[PDB]
Amino acid sequence: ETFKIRKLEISDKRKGFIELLGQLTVTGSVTDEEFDRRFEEIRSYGDDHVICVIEEETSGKIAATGSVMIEKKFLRNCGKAGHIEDVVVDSRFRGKQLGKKVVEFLMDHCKSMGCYKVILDCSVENKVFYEKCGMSNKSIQMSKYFD
Amino acid sequence: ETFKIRKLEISDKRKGFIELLGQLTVTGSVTDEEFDRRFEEIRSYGDDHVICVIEEETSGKIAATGSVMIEKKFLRNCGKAGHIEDVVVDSRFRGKQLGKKVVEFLMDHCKSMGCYKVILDCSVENKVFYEKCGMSNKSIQMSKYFD
Numbered sequence: 139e140t141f142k143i144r145k146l147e148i149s150d151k152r153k154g155f156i157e158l159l160g161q162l163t164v165t166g167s168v169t170d171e172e173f174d175r176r177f178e179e180i181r182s183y184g185d186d187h188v189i190c191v192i193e194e195e196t197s198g199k200i201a202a203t204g205s206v207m208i209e210k211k212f213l214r215n216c217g218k219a220g221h222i223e224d225v226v227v228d229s230r231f232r233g234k235q236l237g238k239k240v241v242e243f244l245m246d247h248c249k250s251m252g253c254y255k256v257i258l259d260c261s262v263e264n265k266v267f268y269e270k271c272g273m274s275n276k277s278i279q280m281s282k283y284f285d
Numbered sequence: 286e287t288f289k290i291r292k293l294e295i296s297d298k299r300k301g302f303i304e305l306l307g308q309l310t311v312t313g314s315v316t317d318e319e320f321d322r323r324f325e326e327i328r329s330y331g332d333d334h335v336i337c338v339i340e341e342e343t344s345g346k347i348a349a350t351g352s353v354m355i356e357k358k359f360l361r362n363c364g365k366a367g368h369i370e371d372v373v374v375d376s377r378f379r380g381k382q383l384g385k386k387v388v389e390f391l392m393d394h395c396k397s398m399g400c401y402k403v404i405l406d407c408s409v410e411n412k413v414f415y416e417k418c419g420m421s422n423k424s425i426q427m428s429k430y431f432d
């Protein structure tokens with residue numbers, strides 16, 4: 139196995155991208171039409187919304203992924219914060235240090251865009267993983283689903 | 286005292302908006318030029334990035350504020366999640382139920398836009414406040430500042 143890190147491309151709909159997201163949470167059965175629609179809506183944000191993928195070359199499937207959306211604010215001298223989302227590594231490839239590579243790629247992008255911070259939410263069990271990526275836990279997440 | 290809830294407007298730079306944000310965290314001394322630049326960059330996102338303010342009428346200053354940025358995803362059938370940010374109530378006006386009004390305004394906007402959830406981060410001490418707004422705490426926030 140060999141791993142290539144890069145951004146999501148429109149052809150990744152045939153490389154198990156949506157299937158890998160399904161290891162994080164419900165995707166539904168996303169059609170090619172819908173995949174392309176939402177790919178172009180995200181591409182429209184340019185550098186303010188980046189999806190990283192790692193492809194495993196032999197299988198030609200996506201092995202890991204993570205996203206970041208840059209939020210412009212008024213505080214912090216009209217600063218910018220990165221929100222890292224949708225980080226998932228295929229269970230087959232856990233222990234291969236792919237999730238760190240994804241997170242670092244997105245942190246590198248946000249530092250380069252002049253963000254003052256990056257944040258993400260995780261389970262209590264995954265705190266120590268993200269501490270290894272230089273992060274700290276000082277707040278909690280609240281959520282409301284419109285189920 | 287009388288309170289009017291609405292969206293941020295370009296004239297709010299003269300109504301203590303940036304001063305109120307300074308009760309949450311560092312703003313720096315944001316110029317009118319920079320305020321207008323960043324107001325128009327956020328306005329450009331339309332319904333995908335809403336800032337709510339509550340003005341206290343007698344003083345004509347902003348008494349509370351909160352923001353939401355809608356993130357488009359591929360999971361959840363190409364769903365949308367609302368990220369509520371930058372929620373702050375002037376210390377003078379705490380106990381007047383303004384923060385609930387702000388949060389509910391932003392949740393109402395996200396439900397109307399078809400989001401499947403809304404999330405935000407808070408201190409452990411403020412968990413119970415947000416539980417009163419119908420939210421639940423099941424994850425933690427990790428952060429990295431580029432200080």
Ligand code: NA
Pocket residue numbers: 208209210211327334
């Ligand atoms: Na923004």
Ligand code: NA
Pocket residue numbers: 180187355356357358
């Ligand atoms: Na988006």
